[PDB]
Symmetry: D2
Subunit: 431 residues, 4 copies
């Protein structure tokens, strides 16, 4: 039983609490789209862990690779190159759109964003960073300063030159021009204000193609193109944070491919390492060249370590070989349609959004007032788990609670059906 | 041969340069205190990789453990607990001095320092951070703002409330009271200045017990005790960064044990993961309790992931079981004495310092003027490698180039002898 | 002649240029609504100098008072009180709305705003300051950080916690809700964004009732009431900068009286000193009490000096006795109607706005496209002067050039007519 | 009587308290080196008001000049030049050392320092400002950020890039090299630390030749020369704040003349206006030229107003004509010797320092322990006033209370004797 008093005594006694609450089970094993508790109860992992288990838990190839290098080439002095590092860097260049040539292989998402923000600052000679008011880039210094969905209070001033602009949210529109929600005019309006505040040091804009932590908010048609233009006109770099959207999850290898807009710096992390700590930034030869001329520095312990890189290489290997990107579209459509049927049945579902296998379900009280359902989400979230479905809802100011659904790209048709099943029972049960 | 033109073409074409230069070899394998090149040439790893390979490369137990969990329990939603996390947290409490009770398991050193600085800020309601002018805590935002040995230029303003004080450097003394280098008076003097500048928001002091990147500078007798008092008197937390000094390297399990001063927050990383990306902060129950009351947040992708934690657990397991801490003292003494004999032979060696298996050798021109040897270090560094010895020199303003020596705690007596050998030949050859 | 080569040689050789250009005349004398050049040519001062000559130039009573104290009580140690200081402080309490009780008598407008911002920061324990993107509060540190109409570039980072929101500009509307320019919804929208960026340290909002430098932009009906509510809800003080609007210029003694909204801190300066350097802040007994408890400090050389204070006292004396406030309404109506007749004649006049004797005329090219007239303003401005009328146009991004008209409250009916005359001739001539 | 209950009721009811306490008298008149109370009691003004009454109170020539322009040329639009402005600017160029050519005429000391700091920032393209830990430059934003003797707490973060270094204080030495107080080595030591913290954006150093608020601390021989070199080597401007030292007070027209070191920007204020609000910055033609090219802006209400400028012109006129500079040396010597005789009599006088008519007397308990006399100063200060002598003591951390003595340069021999008399009686009485 998960009721181990010794276990719980120790957790309570010696663990730093870092946000949220700990689930009241002891996870003993993981395999595929499932995690198993102390009792052996299977919990369908509909969030891919912390949205990282792209190939699901303990993928046989991952296991082989890990063991493979665990005992061959593990960690090295950061000035030393090895084959998995060069092969991974080469692959990343090869699969990203034209204009992205060179990579830096790191350990975490926040770290990847910090490396990119630092590079943007060096190269422009400027320092003000612009992000979305609903963004999430990490907990570390720069990454945090650019995070507005949470964490900005009680911890001192943010980085000097921190600005946010509102993200375009079609479900809950707030800017109109002739009865219509003009998200492009809003963008213009937002930048005018920025221009007036700036000290003349705009260095970059950082963005998620789809704001996950933010509420599964997809940037609408033509927006990214418009944003890049705004950056271009001001001498700013565009940094795209694809921690959650990269590596096939949305149906394209990279979210920026769908829009056809290639950023100046691309960051990857969660999906790339497939549960392991690996991250990266990819930039153009030109930007890297200037950063170099200028003495760019981002020297860490694990930068360019062979093991994680070797892991990243195999992950891309199987995503491509198993056509997991297309898969994401087909399973996504199946999962998406199911959610819509649920929305046909329950008035508590106000919106179903997202792309590929990065979906969101926004819970409301009045499916006309679009009033956030106070506590209903937590209840639902609660019943799912009883029911054996791991979910994750996010609650932000002014919106309804949002369920973030992101199962492994390896998820089965039966597994998708299971989740839909359980979700309905959880709903009817929580109401 | 390491001369693979394809390999080198790809590195050049697709790798972001991040500091320093890449060694001109292709590392194919690693095992024990050695790394092997494309030709199979063995290079004695005298820096333990990036100072992380505590049990040396590909330790059989590490390999077992990694495989062991790679296919059992890998990555999880951050709200889910598992046994390796709780066992590791418990162990850390158990082996650290009294007053350190709760741990947060992360991925990188910089991340560990950020988590601690953030917590210190939350708990005090303040934000100014004090570090050493020769410090090194990482490349990320907060960690960088507190790093003064390098990286502060061309990348915009530092974090608001950033101050440094000079570190006590006995080799190159700069503060005197009655003909004597009074490092305590210097400390008093440094704090008076701080007091005058502060906005009344001093939150914490962050320090390395031994400044590695800084030049292998050991805080002299009674200093840490004096510093903690200075912090105590001002309502500041003391954060000790033991990324390089923790896990037995200096001869005690933790460097703070030797002085007998226990910090408010302890950070670990490099040595803890043994080449893998794992890091941690340990704090007191009281501080964690207040952080909690206050809504502390440090929620990341890999926080509390079982695999790395399981790795950390085994590392501590073998350090204790194989008495690697004592070992560090005995091999250190052997390595230390050898360096002293070299210093008997060569006038270019001005100082041999450090503790246990964290040693430094400062190169000079006039062993009386203590004038930094311009380029001699690089030459030496160069000859070592030809000779088959991986070394690392650090060059800071106003000091001589310093070799940072830190071989695995598993290093053999013969391996230590080998290194000394090669080092002398490299010296006589570079002069 | 103004052509004095010696004079011009010296100006060129020894004057620091501080913005704009120097008029090419030598002003020898001033009296009433006129300034006289080297040739004796009378220039009708339609801007009251730098918008300060409230009683016009060299008012007989001002002259008496100045002489009167120049030789009786001049300057004192700042800890010493005298009668004019106490009488002025008492008067200010007496003529401001209920809720404003205590005054601090200073020297400049920027200084007055700094004193208020500092007090707001002390009292709230917070530091982020919110202003209008088209604001003008001064050139000094804090006052500058809160100024967005200009001066933010090439001079380093602004004060930490600096935010701006768009000012409601009815002529050039930019926020709509059902075909209508909803300036209140815009206000709501602006504050939501603020909320998301803030570090939880909002201290105050600073505003001009009518943005002078900004383009003679009057806050529309119900706005100030809404803004104060926004401040109230967030624990922020409302600071009203009436440097240009105070002392009767707009038709009420203080602009805040018209709206009926009394700020937490009121600042005055330009009009108060009537050309002389005197300024003030007035706050509530409660706020002053807390500032005191907390050790408020704003100790300067001229704070509480009798001479300027004695000047300020007489200025209020004659404004009240001569009913200059009502006068402002009657002469304003006359001046206003004239401007409207001009706008009937010339398509280049797109808007006539303002209140009392604080009027603005916005120049455009297409009185339908409302396109800013490129250079026409400068031409007009140029012809006026030839014609003998001192005017002042302000050119801001996205708007047409705006003439800021503000003649002495003592201006005559004939003088108003003269100005209108000259203005038409200048127009017909510049086209 | 000063006991006017109505007066005191009003002061209490309507005055903002701004630091210190209000003297319990009502100053009715001033003339020469005296201020008179409600009862007609003469108080010898030994601080020249707030250290501004250079020609003493209500100087006949000042009175004439003020009246003279009060009714001729008063205040003007800031783009308009007049003769007193050009004559004053010309004079300043003419009497300052070679290398100072152009002036900007403002209203306050803080404003003058802000104008200079802003200009330094524009011209260097940098922003970090370095000052003395015991400095006093004003209460406004930038000026405050550079002030370390007080006011840094409870009012939010200082300006980004604010650093201080210790001022050389010979009475209380703290840095030694071979038993000797090496203030130059201290300076070197201070700059090394600065170098390590800086973000590579050092713009200027701001300093008082003699720190008044700081405790009458005179920069020792060769220091300024060394400091300018430190600035020169780093591309920093040297800003000299002579608010208290300028216009003859120290025995030379400007304090920087004695050392022979001419700063890049010179600021003046207190003494210049002789009690009235006038201030200035003087810079080199080259610096002004670059500031201009770059769009320097420091446009205020009273910049270039004829009245104050006309006042400043007459002040310089009589200082030169009456040889008040030499006078300062002769009366200073008389005042200085007297203080030394007092120090012969009382063990409570630990030090007599300063230059010309800018003197300081540091009170101690143990004239061997040099222990600050706790409360004795306030008592003395108290008895002086009873006795009819206005004094001003400053109490800073780690030093004894310091009396700041600065009587008008017009002070009489009898007046100096009177003060010495009263001071001794006050001492013997307060002990
Ligand atoms: C005391 C200390 N603290 C933190 C760090 C940063 O850890 P990461 O590089 O894993 O984030 C280092 C290492 N610094 C490097 C070095 O060896 O110089 C890797 C660069 C460290 O030594
Ligand atoms: C777009 C994006 N960028 C960076 C990160 C931070 O990565 P790390 O947590 O590994 O540093 C997240 C994750 N954020 C969390 C979430 O799922 O809410 C883990 C907290 C991310 O989504
Ligand atoms: C060197 C120096 N620089 C600037 C100033 C500020 O000038 P203002 O007070 O007129 O703005 C002072 C005065 N400071 C005070 C003092 O005598 O302590 C008036 C407070 C000054 O001494
Ligand atoms: C609302 C408001 N607040 C403060 C100030 C600054 O006052 P000072 O210039 O006397 O310090 C102005 C004036 N600004 C100027 C203008 O007319 O544009 C003089 C420049 C002001 O209008
Ligand atoms: K590495
Ligand atoms: K996790
Ligand atoms: K005063
Ligand atoms: K003026
Ligand atoms: Na590519
Ligand atoms: Na412990
Ligand atoms: Na009132
Ligand atoms: Na000169």
């Amino acid at each position: 039983l998960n009721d181990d008093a010794t276990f719980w005594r120790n957790a309570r006694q010696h663990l730093v609490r870092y946000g949220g609450t700990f689930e009241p089970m002891i996870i003993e094993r993981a395999k595929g789209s499932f995690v198993y508790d102390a009792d052996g109860r299977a919990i369908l992992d509909f969030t891919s862990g912390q949205m990282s288990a792209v190939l699901g838990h303990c993928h046989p190839e991952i296991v082989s690779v890990i063991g493979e290098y665990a005992g061959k080439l593990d960690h090295l002095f950061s000035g030393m190159l090895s084959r998995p590092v060069v092969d991974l860097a080469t692959r990343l260049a090869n699969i990203t759109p034209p204009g992205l040539d060179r990579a830096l292989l790191l350990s975490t998402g926040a770290e990847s964003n910090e490396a990119a923000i630092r590079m943007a600052k060096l190269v422009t000679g400027k320092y003000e960073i612009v992000g979305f008011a609903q963004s999430w880039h990490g907990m570390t210094g720069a990454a945090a300063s650019a995070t507005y969905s949470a964490g900005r209070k009680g911890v001192g001033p943010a980085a000097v030159g921190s600005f946010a602009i509102p993200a375009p949210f079609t479900y809950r529109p707030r800017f109109e021009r002739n009865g219509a929600y003009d998200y492009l005019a809003e963008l213009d309006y937002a930048f005018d204000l920025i221009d007036r505040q700036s000290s003349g040091n705009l260095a970059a804009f950082i963005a998620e193609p789809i704001l996950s932590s933010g509420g599964i908010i997809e940037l609408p048609d033509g927006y990214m193109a418009a944003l890049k233009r705004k950056c271009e006109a001001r001498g700013m770099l565009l940094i795209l944070d694809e921690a959650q959207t990269g590596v096939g999850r949305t149906g394209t290898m990279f979210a920026c491919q769908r829009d056809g807009v290639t950023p100046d710096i691309l960051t990857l992390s969660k999906t790339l390492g497939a549960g392991l700590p690996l991250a990266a930034i990819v930039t153009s030869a030109a930007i890297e060249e200037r950063a170099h001329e200028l003495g760019y520095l981002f020297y860490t312990t694990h930068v360019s370590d062979p093991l994680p890189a070797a892991v990243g290489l195999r992950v891309l290997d199987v995503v491509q070989r198993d056509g997991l990107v297309a898969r994401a579209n087909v399973m996504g459509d199946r999962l998406r349609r199911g959610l819509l049927d649920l929305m046909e049945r329950f008035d508590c579902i106000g919106d179903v959004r997202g792309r590929g296998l990065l979906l969101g379900v926004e819970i409301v009280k009045d499916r006309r007032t679009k009033e956030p359902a106070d506590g209903l989400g937590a209840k639902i979230t609660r019943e799912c788990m009883n029911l054996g479905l791991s979910m994750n809802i996010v609650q932000l100011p002014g919106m309804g609670g949002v369920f973030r659904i992101a199962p492994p790209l390896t998820v089965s048709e039966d597994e998708i059906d299971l989740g839909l099943s359980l979700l309905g029972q959880a709903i009817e049960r929580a109401l």
